[PDB]
Amino acid sequence: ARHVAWLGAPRSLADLVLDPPQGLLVQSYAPRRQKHGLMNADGWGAGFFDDDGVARRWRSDKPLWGDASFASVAPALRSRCVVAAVRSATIGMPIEPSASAPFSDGQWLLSHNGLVDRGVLPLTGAAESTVDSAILAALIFSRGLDALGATIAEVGELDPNARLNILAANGSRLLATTWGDTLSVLRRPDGVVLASEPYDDDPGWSDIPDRHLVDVRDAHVVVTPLLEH
Amino acid sequence: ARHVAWLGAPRSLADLVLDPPQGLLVQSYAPRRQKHGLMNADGWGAGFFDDDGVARRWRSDKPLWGDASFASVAPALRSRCVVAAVRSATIGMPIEPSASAPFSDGQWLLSHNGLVDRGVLPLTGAAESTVDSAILAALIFSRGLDALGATIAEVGELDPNARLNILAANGSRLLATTWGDTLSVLRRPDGVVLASEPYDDDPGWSDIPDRHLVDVRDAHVVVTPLLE
Amino acid sequence: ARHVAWLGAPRSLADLVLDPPQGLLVQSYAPRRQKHGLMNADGWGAGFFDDDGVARRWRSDKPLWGDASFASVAPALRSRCVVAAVRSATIGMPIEPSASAPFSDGQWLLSHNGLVDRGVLPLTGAAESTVDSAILAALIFSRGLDALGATIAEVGELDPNARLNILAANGSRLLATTWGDTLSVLRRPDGVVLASEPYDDDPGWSDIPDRHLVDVRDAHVVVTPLLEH
Amino acid sequence: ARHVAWLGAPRSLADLVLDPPQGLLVQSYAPRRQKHGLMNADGWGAGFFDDDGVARRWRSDKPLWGDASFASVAPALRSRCVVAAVRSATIGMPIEPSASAPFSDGQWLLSHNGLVDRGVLPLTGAAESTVDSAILAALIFSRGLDALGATIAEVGELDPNARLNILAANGSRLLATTWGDTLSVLRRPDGVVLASEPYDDDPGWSDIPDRHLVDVRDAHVVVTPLL
Ligand SMILES: C[N+](C)(C)[C@@H](Cc1c[nH]c([S@@](=O)C[C@H](NC(=O)CC[C@H]([NH3+])C(=O)O)C(=O)O)n1)C(=O)O
Ligand SMILES: C[N+](C)(C)[C@@H](Cc1c[nH]c([S@@](=O)C[C@H](NC(=O)CC[C@H]([NH3+])C(=O)O)C(=O)O)n1)C(=O)O
Ligand SMILES: C[N+](C)(C)[C@@H](Cc1c[nH]c([S@@](=O)C[C@H](NC(=O)CC[C@H]([NH3+])C(=O)O)C(=O)O)n1)C(=O)O
Numbered sequence: 001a002r003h004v005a006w007l008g009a010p011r012s013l014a015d016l017v018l019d020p021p022q023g024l025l026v027q028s029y030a031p032r033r034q035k036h037g038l039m040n041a042d043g044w045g046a047g048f049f050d051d052d053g054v055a056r057r058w059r060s061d062k063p064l065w066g067d068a069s070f071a072s073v074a075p076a077l078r079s080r081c082v083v084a085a086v087r088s089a090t091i092g093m094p095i096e097p098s099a100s101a102p103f104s105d106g107q108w109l110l111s112h113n114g115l116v117d118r119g120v121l122p123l124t125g126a127a128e129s130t131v132d133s134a135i136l137a138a139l140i141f142s143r144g145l146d147a148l149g150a151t152i153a154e155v156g157e158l159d160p161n162a163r164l165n166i167l168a169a170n171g172s173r174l175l176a177t178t179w180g181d182t183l184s185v186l187r188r189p190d191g192v193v194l195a196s197e198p199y200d201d202d203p204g205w206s207d208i209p210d211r212h213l214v215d216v217r218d219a220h221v222v223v224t225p226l227l228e229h
Numbered sequence: 230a231r232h233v234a235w236l237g238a239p240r241s242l243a244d245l246v247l248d249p250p251q252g253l254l255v256q257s258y259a260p261r262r263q264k265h266g267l268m269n270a271d272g273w274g275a276g277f278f279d280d281d282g283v284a285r286r287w288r289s290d291k292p293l294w295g296d297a298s299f300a301s302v303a304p305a306l307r308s309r310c311v312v313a314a315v316r317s318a319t320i321g322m323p324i325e326p327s328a329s330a331p332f333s334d335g336q337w338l339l340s341h342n343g344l345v346d347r348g349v350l351p352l353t354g355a356a357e358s359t360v361d362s363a364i365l366a367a368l369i370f371s372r373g374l375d376a377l378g379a380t381i382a383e384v385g386e387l388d389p390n391a392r393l394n395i396l397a398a399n400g401s402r403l404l405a406t407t408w409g410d411t412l413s414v415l416r417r418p419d420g421v422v423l424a425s426e427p428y429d430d431d432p433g434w435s436d437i438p439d440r441h442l443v444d445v446r447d448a449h450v451v452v453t454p455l456l457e
Numbered sequence: 458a459r460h461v462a463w464l465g466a467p468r469s470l471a472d473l474v475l476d477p478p479q480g481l482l483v484q485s486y487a488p489r490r491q492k493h494g495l496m497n498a499d500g501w502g503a504g505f506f507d508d509d510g511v512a513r514r515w516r517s518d519k520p521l522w523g524d525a526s527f528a529s530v531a532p533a534l535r536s537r538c539v540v541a542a543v544r545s546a547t548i549g550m551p552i553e554p555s556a557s558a559p560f561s562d563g564q565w566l567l568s569h570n571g572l573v574d575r576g577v578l579p580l581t582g583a584a585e586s587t588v589d590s591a592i593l594a595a596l597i598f599s600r601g602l603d604a605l606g607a608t609i610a611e612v613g614e615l616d617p618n619a620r621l622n623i624l625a626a627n628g629s630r631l632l633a634t635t636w637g638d639t640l641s642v643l644r645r646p647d648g649v650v651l652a653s654e655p656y657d658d659d660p661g662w663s664d665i666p667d668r669h670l671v672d673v674r675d676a677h678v679v680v681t682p683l684l685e686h
Numbered sequence: 687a688r689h690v691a692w693l694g695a696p697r698s699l700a701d702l703v704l705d706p707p708q709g710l711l712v713q714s715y716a717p718r719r720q721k722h723g724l725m726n727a728d729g730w731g732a733g734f735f736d737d738d739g740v741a742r743r744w745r746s747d748k749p750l751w752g753d754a755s756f757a758s759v760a761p762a763l764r765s766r767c768v769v770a771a772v773r774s775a776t777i778g779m780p781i782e783p784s785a786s787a788p789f790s791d792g793q794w795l796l797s798h799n800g801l802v803d804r805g806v807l808p809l810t811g812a813a814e815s816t817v818d819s820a821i822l823a824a825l826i827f828s829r830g831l832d833a834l835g836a837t838i839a840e841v842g843e844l845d846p847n848a849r850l851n852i853l854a855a856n857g858s859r860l861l862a863t864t865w866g867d868t869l870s871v872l873r874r875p876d877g878v879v880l881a882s883e884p885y886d887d888d889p890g891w892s893d894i895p896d897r898h899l900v901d902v903r904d905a906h907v908v909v910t911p912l913l
């Protein structure tokens with residue numbers, strides 16, 4: 001999987017996801033910094049907050065590059081806060097829009113890049129899908145996003161093989177973790193991007209070190225360490 | 230099929246298509262004035278013009294009522310000019326979003342409710358799909374929407390069993406034909422609705438007689454007969 | 458929802474599902490004895506057991522009537538034991554093949570016609586989907602099909618508003634419950650059909666009364682009541 | 687696109703398409719001999735002839751690798767004659783099962799790997815989709831498969847940039863053309879495979895030269911240049 005998020009002045013979904021020369025559209029078939037999986041063709045999702053702060057989501061189980069509707073409509077959807085993703089799944093896992101990030105609890109949008117043993121996670125009746133990312137999202141939402149660092153550090157200890165890159169947003173804040181996969185940040189005059197990988201060659205891109213939490217709010221960017229055992 | 234169009238002040242796709250008590254969402258499974266087909270569950274589409282006049286379209290091969298993405302996003306999509314439809318197809322016909330109205334030539338959005346023998350229509354290399362409505366749309370676009378009434382009269386004489394209800398828009402105009410199926414008009418304070426059937430029980434709804442052309446601009450509604 | 462099952466000498470999926478004049482194909486848009494939902498256009502599924510006893514499944518999130526692939530291929534798929542369904546879901550529920558019956562635990566195929574409050578069911582890590590029927594299937598599989606009648610009575614007391622029509626098969630047995638919806642049986646010389654409603658007007662169809670269990674094995678059809686509350 | 691065909695003793699769709707270590711399933715995300723397109727994730731199809739000679743088809747607009755239904759059912763579908771394909775399309779082209787090979791006229795199954803300018807082909811009302819492969823399939827069916835070589839030779843001159851790899855079958859015959867893309871043949875004891883590329887490293891695989899017709903029946907493989 002690859003994901004991208006925006007917090008700042010209104011930006012179109014197309015401008016963030018489709019239009020950049022190495023953005024999510026390109027990453028669906030030719031990602032640059034992806035160690036696990038060749039591509040991200042098992043679905044996609046784009047979530048945003050409208051003027052009234054309502055979380056809205058377009059999700060699909062198809063390759064992003066072939067979605068003519070999104071290509072047509074995305075330029076007309078603008079938001080101060082966006083989380084989008086393209087999905088990669090091991091052969092045999094369920095293909096369904098409910099399994100594509102971003103997940104939502106109504107307040108937060110959330111994407112997971114990685115893998116986790118569902119056996120170490122609590123059972124839940126609140127997940128959007130059966131896929132590991134949805135079970136993990138349910139746990140994260142249950143604990144609260146203010147506790148994201150704790151949740152990820154804990155799950156990372158329960159499953160030493162897990163990769164736990166989270167990217168989340170609530171309309172006025174971004175949260176992310178690096179735990180076994182990539183993330184970069186771009187600070188623009190008008191807002192902040194977090195992305196699995198840079199969507200162009202802007203010299204402003206900087207890479208987030210592994211095992212960190214990123215917290216973006218009030219024009220501040222915090223990159224702070226997570227607990228390791 | 231059932232379709233609906235809006236021309237007026239900015240209106241959300243949800244407000245036009247999903248929210249009314251008997252609007253297109255409800256018509257996908259329980260239409261009230263549909264003589265042909267039980268439902269409209271073979272796909273859907275919603276086209277609109279953005280602030281720069283660009284025609285944009287969301288189309289699907291699935292039942293409208295089940296599309297969680299559209300239900301979530303439609304309230305955030307607002308436009309002065311919308312054409313939307315829900316598709317019904319006889320069993321065996323191809324199911325694919327390219328076959329769902331509205332069709333487009335970049336300037337005009339167009340929906341067809343009815344049936345026409347592709348055998349009487351010209352062959353084309355410009356259709357979006359193989360289905361009869363797409364072949365008919367290609368013809369209509371080729372003749373130009375200013376000739377819509379004449380084109381429909383022509384096709385109607387070529388295929389006396391054809392039903393040829395067209396609903397089209399270019400961002401500042403609506404055009405529609407009645408030819409064998411239903412159409413109604415609602416004049417609101419802020420714009421005009423044209424629809425296969427009323428989306429509620431507003432007393433302002435009036436029915437368009439069969440074999441007529443409807444022309445809407447700047448909330449002016451002109452209804453004229455088609456050629457005999 | 459409507460479902461149908463077969464146990465006997467081999468019959469093709471088309472023969473059971475598509476070809477009868479009032480079979481599952483027709484029921485996807487024009488059911489005859491369906492009190493809840495106008496139609497069954499939210500997906501479909503056909504499960505069968507092959508010659509080696511392996512459970513195989515074709516599932517979809519599309520209306521059965523439009524599925525050109527199934528219409529083409531179904532006549533070539535023959536089995537001694539079949540469970541098939543067409544899905545109907547209330548607006549807003551997840552549309553995905555994993556949510557379409559039949560569900561499977563590898564030994565049993567299972568379809569549910571009705572609805573149940575997921576809040577009264579146990580949490581599980583074994584569900585195929587988040588839909589209520591999948592959570593219910595997980596419970597049924599966990600309790601064992603030999604306890605089906607008792608499990609359904611129990612759930613029926615936990616949720617007095619639930620409808621709990623189950624149809625299940627393991628290659629050599631059918632099991633079914635009536636709990637708020639319809640079921641009929643047809644005894645042919647070559648096997649037994651159980652179905653939500655008759656797929657034709659054969660006078661041989663018999664209706665199963667509500668709140669009963671049906672057990673088909675060794676060419677015997679045994680119908681028994683369920684527990685009192 | 688990549689395609690594969692079988693003519694011989696009954697073989698399951700899974701055995702031909704899913705199970706080989708470098709078969710169509712793998713080619714959907716990691717083809718080995720494909721110059722055009724990185725993958726074949728824009729749909730798939732598997733056509734076969736049943737015991738009574740009826741042509742049947744399963745087609746999809748999704749990536750082959752993710753189709754749980756096909757993975758489950760394919761081992762139970764056996765046939766003496768199969769044509770299957772995975773589709774690749776440039777970004778923006780219609781995604782729809784009607785556009786996925788194999789196409790059919792009821793007698794013949796047909797797959798096209800390549801590209802052709804629809805502008806040089808006759809208009810048609812008989813195509814299954816609007817995509818160039820479907821327009822070409824319509825022309826080929828119209829002319830008749832007994833004329834496949836002549837039709838492909840003609841279209842290849844009408845459009846000197848066209849790539850026109852056809853793989854077709856009627857239950858008792860395979861026909862194929864090489865015209866700008868790859869094709870290999872494997873002769874097994876129980877039948878013949880034709881494929882865009884070898885599905886394993888069997889030493890029996892041999893490559894068909896470009897601009898040739900391949901005609902398979904009665905376990906004879908006749909390879910001739912196109913006239
Ligand atoms: C289907 N295929 C195209 C072959 C995929 C197969 C694949 C293998 N590994 C991957 S990874 O990108 C996904 C992997 N995690 C998972 O598969 C678990 C499911 C994932 N959380 C999900 O959202 O489905 C990871 O991020 O480590 N994809 C590809 O190569 O992209
Ligand atoms: C698939 N099914 C649910 C059984 C349908 C079958 C059906 C029969 N007739 C209809 S009508 O709404 C469509 C009919 N026209 C066509 O089928 C030609 C194709 C149509 N123009 C289209 O856009 O696909 C018409 O408008 O007179 N649907 C239904 O009952 O709605
Ligand atoms: C979407 N729509 C076409 C409007 C449907 C809406 C509807 C209302 N009630 C029904 S019923 O067939 C389903 C209802 N149960 C549910 O919706 C729970 C989910 C169901 N178990 C499932 O498999 O999704 C029941 O069986 O009592 N469908 C229809 O009328 O068929």
Ligand SMILES: C[N+](C)(C)[C@@H](Cc1c[nH]c([S@@](=O)C[C@H](NC(=O)CC[C@H]([NH3+])C(=O)O)C(=O)O)n1)C(=O)O
Nearest residue numbers: 029687722723724725726774775776777800801819
């Ligand atoms: C969508 N994407 C994943 C980026 C594709 C883009 C792509 C570029 N070129 C190709 S090729 O495999 C298809 C190309 N022909 C066409 O695109 C015409 C349409 C094709 N006949 C079809 O059946 O759709 C060819 O065979 O030379 N795919 C990929 O890289 O596989």
